[PDB]
Design a protein around this ligand. Structure first.
Ligand SMILES: CCCCCCCCCCCCCCCCCC(=O)OC[C@H](COP(=O)([O-])OCC(O)COP(=O)([O-])OC[C@@H](COC(=O)CCCCCCCCCCCCCCCCC)OC(=O)CCCCCCCCCCCCCCCCC)OC(=O)CCCCCCCCCCCCCCCCC
Ligand SMILES: CCCCCCCCCCCCCCCCCC(=O)OC[C@H](COP(=O)([O-])OCC(O)COP(=O)([O-])OC[C@@H](COC(=O)CCCCCCCCCCCCCCCCC)OC(=O)CCCCCCCCCCCCCCCCC)OC(=O)CCCCCCCCCCCCCCCCC
Ligand SMILES: CCCCCCCCCCCCCCCCCC(=O)OC[C@H](COP(=O)([O-])OCC[N+](C)(C)C)OC(=O)CCCCCCCCCCCCCCCCC
Ligand SMILES: CCCCCCCCCCCCCCCCCC(=O)OC[C@H](COP(=O)([O-])OCC[N+](C)(C)C)OC(=O)CCCCCCCCCCCCCCCCC
Ligand SMILES: CCCCCCCCCCCCCCCCCC(=O)OC[C@H](COP(=O)(O)OCCN)OC(=O)CCCCCCCCCCCCCCCCC
Ligand SMILES: CCCCCCCCCCCCCCCCCC(=O)OC[C@H](COP(=O)(O)OCCN)OC(=O)CCCCCCCCCCCCCCCCC
Ligand SMILES: CCCCCCCCCCCCCCCCCC(=O)OC[C@H](COP(=O)(O)OCCN)OC(=O)CCCCCCCCCCCCCCCCC
Ligand code: HEC
Ligand code: HEM
Ligand code: HEM
Ligand code: HEM
Lengths: 65, 98, 237, 52, 74, 56, 32, 379, 54, 54
């Protein structure tokens, strides 16, 4: 049993807002992983990645339910 | 010079539209009602007609037509001498009281 | 913080109402998912009848649970089958027991949960479908879980619902998103039972306001017709 | 107002009414201390500090 | 202060009509709309700018608060 | 002119005027309730516990 | 004189029924 | 034989009040709000009675009793939300009435103006006190903050907060005393409103022009009853729109949560009609100075009759004063918005600056503008 | 009036609310009582008009 | 508190715990009693001296 949400989320992944958000998230990922002890936590650009993705999803998903 | 600013303010005031002279717009304090009582018959009758017409106009929210607005140079300070006399008498009484 | 999106709920319309079949399914979700940890004491099985269940179904549902109440002739607290009079069962006897049971955190009362959080259902839904993996650089203490929507970015609740977490009585798939939607709309119904009535409350009034306003105003203008047409003339000697 | 109260006869009235108003103020202060049972003042006065 | 001795007035002639003989809405849109535009033009220049500066300061405060919540590259 | 005869027969007297209001209130409440309710379930068809109770 | 005053025309306001100077108002009074 | 309308004592009073009372013809809608307030008073009081018929003031039952009213009581949710949004609409009408009084020089009726200030004080106290009654998280926590503000008063002040609380902090005694005072106060408001109407009826209302309208006065009953009926109907339109479509619009959702004194809410804020003076309180750093500024922000209305210096009572013919008044209105909106927001950058500086500008406009800009106004008109 | 059932929780609350509201109505009615009394004066023990000894 | 489960306990708390609460409680009760005494005496006066002609 696959979910409507996962496929809607995957289709919402490939829009340009989420593309730039994913690039910024990956940059922070490599930055924080490389540095041993830094309080810089990739929460905020993760939040923008969400804010793009969940809005894109909420515009479409309820029709699939 | 300042008279241009004065004319602009008279145009932007509003009571010229309502067909009111300047002295029709002054707040009625004790000095003012005494001066109004002191007015001659003709001036008082014209004043009350003007005020009543203005109140009618603002009740209907219709400004009086353009051409017969109270012009700046046609504005007469009829109340001013009586108000000045009233203020002078009041000031004299207060000086005597002191 | 990251707030909730603006999901197009079926009841979000100005004069729309909740889907009662989804209310019933969400209530099933509440029974068989979170009724073991969360309490909804402010609602009773009586509220269920007439909006999501019939009288016989409500009676059977009530007797399926056991409630301890009343002192007997010997004074002991005896347990009897639940009835329509009883409110929803409380999974934990006292709140301190609940906190000590889970992690010290208290599962909030689900009766008013939707009307208490800024965002409404769109918040709670976003939380339930928002269970994510902690990002790089954020540590996780073993026992907590990461949810972007929860203030504090760390929730003390394990992922409640997922795929095939239940079996709906009707037969609709029990996938995670559908379960979240149904339980969220059921929680909206529980928080604001008058919702449907309120909408029916409004519509009539709106049509009523389409009828009294143009009349009374007209009457006013009618009664003003004397003054607005009044004409004056000055005739000094 | 400001100037109309600034006259010789007005200061004459002020001088005339200073005693009555000033000791009305003492009346009010004594009444306040009495009503509130102000221990800060009532302690010093004799025969009443015994109430504490 | 009641009808009968409110004030003194002379040589004033006033007319009106019964509410049952004249229209309650005499050209409600023919002169009503031009009147509305006239009053709006009269009051707009002195009403709007205080509200528009509030609009700008509200937007600036909100955006600056959001920016402050963002991390400042450190 | 229907309004003329209507006024002359049932509006001139205040007593018959009040009878008109009181009697017409019955049927206005009737019709308005029915029309507004019908509109309400027309907008929300299938989502109330009135179009699905037959299923249960 | 008192005979030199006349009621200003209200034709901009009169209802359509009572608008002509040659119909008694009693006929349309009931309708209005 | 004499008219029962103007010979029977009660009927004579009613006749001279709002049947045959002369009124200005050019009264705009801005005066209708007055009657609206009275309506918004009665529509409140009656509803309150019904709420008081299913409310049990106690820290173990207050929230439960309110919930029982909302769900179980036949048409109880409508009464509850009617009450809340009616208080909100009452404050809307009160603010609009105060704005009208400022704009058209209505404060020249000094006695009516002072009685109105007293009524406004009593209404703020009643609403602040009433918001405690549901005993939500926001209710209790806001009450703690507001009452603890009185600790800043020198000497006696601390004891006062112990006196008002009925103990060491806001507890059941505070809740029940707040309930009792919330019951009694609206009738004091009714008596004060009767006195306010008496003072106004002595001199008569003021037309938008500001000139005396004694020459053109119309009877109150034939006209200014149905107009007030239309105004009250419009007010009801708005109020039932709020109640029936967005019930918890202005109210904070955090109220729908049992008052737990073990958890401070994310942001403690009062009602939208309280956020402006609370933001003024926030602006001043000193605690005692904060309370002084808070009380002065409303008490400054009494100074308005003295600060008037322009020869024209109203503002229709003072465009500069109109711009200043609208600047003041925008400043109050800014105060409300700032009070809503937390005390962070840049909200601190914006709130401070708007707080200074409030008093600066009321005390300085308006009188100086009035002097320039008189000078610009040869007088 | 009695809340159905018996004299129970609802009855106590509504009785308290009415008990609170009513005395203010009593105050208003007492003001009206004096207002009606004043223009007639008062009835002296003898029952005769006392307009010559007020 | 007007709740039925705690009204009597609230009254006992008034009479037992509040500072000078018993004074207020018994003053209230006996003041109601005196109000009725004075009301009966007032009605007796009105009926007697013919004041009911007002
Ligand atoms: C929160 C507040 C709640 C309460 C709000 C209402 C309180 C007062 C209600 C009673 C009242 O003041 O009635 C008179 C008041 C103003 O006078 P009026 O009844 O229009 O009579 C003609 C005017 O004097 C002058 O009319 P005019 O020459 O401008 O032409 C007609 C019309 C403009 O002509 C139009 O066609 C309107 C624009 C379309 O003017 C209007 O003001 C129309 C307003 C309604 C649309 O009535 C209204 O404003 C209508 C009801 C309120 C509508 C919303 C206003 C904002
Ligand atoms: C379309 C563009 C204009 C939108 C309205 C704003 C505007 O320029 O209003 C000009 C004007 C108000 O300014 P004004 O004529 O210089 O002063 C009229 C007085 O305030 C006396 O006004 P009034 O009581 O005779 O009737 C208007 C009054 C009536 O207000 C109320 O009844 C209370 C509710 C509004 C507060 O509402 C307003 O003045 C509020 C205007 C903005 C909201 C609409 O209103 C109109 O021409 C029509 C208002 C109703 C439109 C529907
Ligand atoms: C106001 C000054 C008089 C009242 C006062 O401060 O204390 C009076 C009396 C006696 O006070 P006291 O002398 O025991 O202590 C004074 C210091 N405080 C007030 C902080 C306890 O106290 C009261 O009446 C209670 C304090 C509030 C009064 C209002
Ligand atoms: C709280 C404050 C009010 C808030 C709401 C405000 C809006 C609604 C109320 C006011 C609406 C407008 C006025 C309605 C009443 C009215 O028309 O009064 C004038 C009208 C008179 O208007 P009229 O003078 O145009 O018509 C009558 C004159 N003849 C007879 C020649 C036609 O009053 C009446 O008609 C009274 C009739 C008798 C009493 C009522 C009878 C019906 C009762 C029905 C209920 C069951 C019993
Ligand atoms: C904004 C405009 C509308 C406001 C609300 C109108 C409600 C209904 C008013 C009414 O009864 O009539 C309105 C209009 C004109 O009515 P009136 O000016 O009285 O003239 C009647 C004779 N032609 O007459 C009509 O609309 C037709 C009546 C038949
Ligand atoms: C309200 C928005 C509409 C508005 O204000 O329109 C302008 C209108 C003009 O009024 P008027 O006296 O005709 O102006 C003549 C100018 N030559 O009206 C005005 O300029 C006066 C409006 C203000 C006076 C009445 C109060 C209304 C509520 C205003 C907000 C109050 C907020 C709290 C303030 C304390
Ligand atoms: C016990 C009640 C009476 C107490 C006072 C003593 C008494 O009996 O007073 C009688 C008194 C007679 O005096 P008077 O009314 O002036 O008539 C004189 C006729 N030669 O007359 C009165 O005192 C009449 C008083 C009537 C109202 C009070 C008594 C009734 C109260 C309950 C009703
Ligand atoms: C076995 C335990 C358990 C299950 C199952 C569970 N929860 Fe929770 N929940 C918790 C605990 C513990 C917290 C406290 C976390 C905070 O802090 C919590 C928190 C919450 C909150 C508070 C979030 C907020 O701040 O508004 C909501 C809403 C909630 N749960 C709803 C649900 C719903 C809906 C379900 C299932 C359909 C569910 N929970 C399943 C234990 C559980
Ligand atoms: C001056 C008019 C009044 C105002 C402004 C006012 C204000 C308020 C407010 C703001 C609340 C809180 C609403 C909420 O829960 O969100 C409230 C609650 C309450 N008021 Fe009033 N009130 C008024 C008159 C009255 C009167 C006269 C009574 C008594 C008859 C009363 C009894 C209550 C009760 C019992 C509550 C608690 C129920 C509740 O909170 O919903 N009110 N009041
Ligand atoms: C309890 C709420 C209040 C009620 C019921 C009330 C009642 C009224 C009413 C019915 C009027 C006549 C209509 C009008 O002019 O608007 C009026 C006038 C007035 N009120 Fe109020 N009022 C209240 C609050 C206030 C407040 C807060 C003030 C300001 C401090 C105030 C000051 C005035 C003034 C100055 C007038 C005269 C306005 C004029 O003549 O143009 N009132 N009041
Ligand atoms: C709420 C309780 C009442 C209050 C506060 C009240 C108040 C007063 C007051 C102060 C007087 C003038 C003093 C006097 O003549 O006795 C008076 C006179 C009067 N009251 Fe009352 N009254 C009350 C109840 C009643 C009752 C129950 C009646 C009888 C039905 C009544 C009928 C009268 C009459 C007839 C007078 C005229 C007495 C006279 O002048 O001889 N009152 N009332």
């Amino acid at each position: 049993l696959v979910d409507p949400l996962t496929t809607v989320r995957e289709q919402c992944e490939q829009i340009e807002k989420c593309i730039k958000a994913r690039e910024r998230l990956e940059l922070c990922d490599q930055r924080v992983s490389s540095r041993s002890q830094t309080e810089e936590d990739c929460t905020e650009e993760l939040f923008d990645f969400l804010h793009a993705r969940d809005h894109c999803v909420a515009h479409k998903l309820f029709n699939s339910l | 010079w300042l008279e241009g600013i004065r004319k602009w303010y008279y145009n932007a005031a509003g009571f010229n539209k309502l067909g009111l002279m300047r002295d029709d717009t002054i707040y009625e304090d004790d000095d003012v009602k005494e001066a109004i009582r002191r007015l001659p018959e003709n001036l008082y009758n014209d004043r009350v007609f003007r005020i009543k017409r203005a109140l009618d106009l603002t009740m209907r929210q219709q400004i009086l037509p353009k051409e017969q607005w109270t012009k700046y140079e046609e504005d007469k300070f009829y109340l001013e001498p009586y108000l000045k006399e009233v203020i002078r008498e009041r000031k004299e009484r207060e000086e005597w009281a002191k | 913080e990251l707030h909730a999106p603006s999901y197009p709920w079926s009841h979000r319309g100005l004069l729309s109402s909740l889907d009662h079949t989804s209310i019933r399914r969400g209530f099933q979700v509440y029974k068989q998912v979170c009724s073991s940890c969360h309490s909804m004491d402010y609602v009773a099985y009586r509220h269920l009848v007439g909006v999501c269940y019939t009288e016989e179904e409500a009676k059977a549902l009530a007797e399926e649970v056991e409630v301890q109440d009343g002192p007997n002739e010997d004074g002991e607290m005896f347990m009897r089958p639940g009835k329509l009079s009883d409110y929803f069962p409380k999974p934990y006897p006292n709140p301190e027991a609940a906190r000590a049971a889970n992690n010290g955190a208290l599962p909030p009362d689900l009766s008013y949960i939707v009307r208490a959080r800024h965002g409404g259902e769109d918040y709670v839904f976003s939380l339930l479908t928002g269970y994510c993996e902690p990002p790089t650089g954020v540590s996780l203490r073993e026992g907590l879980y990461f949810n972007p929507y929860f203030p504090g970015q760390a929730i003390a609740m394990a992922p409640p619902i997922y795929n095939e977490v239940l079996e709906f009585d009707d037969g609709t798939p029990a996938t995670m998103s559908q379960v979240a939607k149904d339980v969220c709309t059921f929680l909206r119904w529980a928080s604001e039972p008058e919702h449907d009535h309120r909408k029916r409350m409004g519509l009539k009034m709106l049509m009523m306001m389409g009828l009294l306003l143009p009349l009374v105003y007209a009457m006013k203008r009618h009664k003003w017709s004397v003054l607005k047409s009044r004409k004056l003339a000055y005739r000094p000697p | 107002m400001l100037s109309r109260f600034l006259g010789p006869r007005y200061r004459e009235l002020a001088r005339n009414w200073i005693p009555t108003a000033s000791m009305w103020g003492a009346v009010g202060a004594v009444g306040l201390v009495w009503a509130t049972d102000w221990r800060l003042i009532l302690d010093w006065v004799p025969y009443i500090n015994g109430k504490f | 202060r009641e009808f009968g001795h409110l004030t003194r007035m002379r040589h004033v002639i006033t007319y009106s009509l019964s509410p049952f003989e004249q229209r309650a809405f005499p050209h409600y849109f023919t002169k009503g709309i031009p009147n509305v535009l006239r009053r709006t033009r009269a009051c707009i220049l002195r009403v709007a700018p205080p509200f528009v500066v509030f609009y700008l300061v509200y937007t600036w405060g909100t955006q600056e608060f959001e920016k402050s919540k963002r991390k400042n590259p450190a | 002119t229907l309004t003329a005869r209507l006024y002359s027969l049932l509006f001139r007297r205040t007593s018959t005027f009040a009878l008109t209001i009181a009697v017409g209130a019955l049927f206005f409440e009737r019709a308005f309730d029915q029309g507004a309710d019908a509109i309400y379930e027309h907008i929300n068809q299938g989502k109330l516990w009135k179009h699905i109770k037959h299923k249960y | 004189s008192h005979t030199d005053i006349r009621v200003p025309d209200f034709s901009d306001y009169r209802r359509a029924e009572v608008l002509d100077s040659t119909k008694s108002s009693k006929e349309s009074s009931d309708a209005r | 034989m004499t008219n029962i309308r103007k010979s029977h004592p009660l009927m004579k009073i009613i006749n001279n009040a709002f049947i045959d009372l002369p009124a200005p013809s050019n009264i705009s809608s801005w005066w209708n709000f007055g009657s609206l307030l009275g309506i918004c008073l009665i529509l409140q009081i009656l509803t309150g009675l019904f709420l008081a018929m299913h409310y049990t003031s106690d820290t173990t039952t207050a929230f439960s009793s309110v919930t029982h009213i909302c769900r179980d009581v036949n048409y109880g949710w409508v009464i509850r939300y009617l009450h809340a949004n009616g208080a909100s609409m009452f404050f809307i009408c009160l603010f609009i009435h105060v704005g009208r009084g400022l704009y058209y020089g209505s404060y020249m009726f000094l006695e009516t103006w002072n009685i109105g200030v007293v009524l406004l004080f009593t209404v703020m106290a009643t609403a602040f006190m009433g918001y405690v009654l549901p005993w939500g998280q926001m209710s209790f926590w806001g009450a703690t903050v507001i009452t603890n503000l009185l600790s800043a008063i020198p000497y006696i002040g601390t004891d006062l907060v112990e006196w008002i609380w009925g103990g060491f902090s806001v507890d059941k005694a505070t809740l029940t005393r707040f309930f009792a005072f919330h019951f009694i106060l609206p009738f004091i408001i009714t008596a004060l409103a009767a006195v306010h109407l008496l003072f106004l009826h002595e001199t008569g209302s003021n037309n938008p022009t500001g000139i005396s309208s004694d020459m053109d006065k119309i009877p109150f009953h034939p006209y200014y009853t149905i107009k007030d009926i239309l105004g009250a109907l419009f007010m009801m339109l708005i109020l039932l729109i709020l109640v029936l479509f967005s019930p918890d619009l202005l109210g904070d959702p955090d109220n729908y949560t049992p008052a737990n004194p073990l958890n401070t809410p994310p942001h403690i804020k009062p009602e939208w009609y309280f956020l402006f003076a609370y933001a003024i309180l926030r602006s001043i750093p000193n605690k005692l100075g904060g309370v002084l500024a808070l009380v002065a922000s409303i008490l400054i209305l009494i100074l308005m009759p003295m600060l008037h210096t322009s020869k024209q009572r109203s503002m229709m013919f003072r465009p500069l004063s109109q711009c200043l008044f609208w600047m003041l209105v925008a400043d109050l909106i800014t105060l409300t918005w700032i009070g809503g927001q937390p005390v962070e950058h840049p909200f601190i500086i914006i709130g401070q600056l708007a707080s200074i500008l409030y008093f600066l406009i009321i005390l300085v800009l308006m009188p100086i503008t009035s002097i320039i106004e008189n000078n610009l008109l040869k007088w």
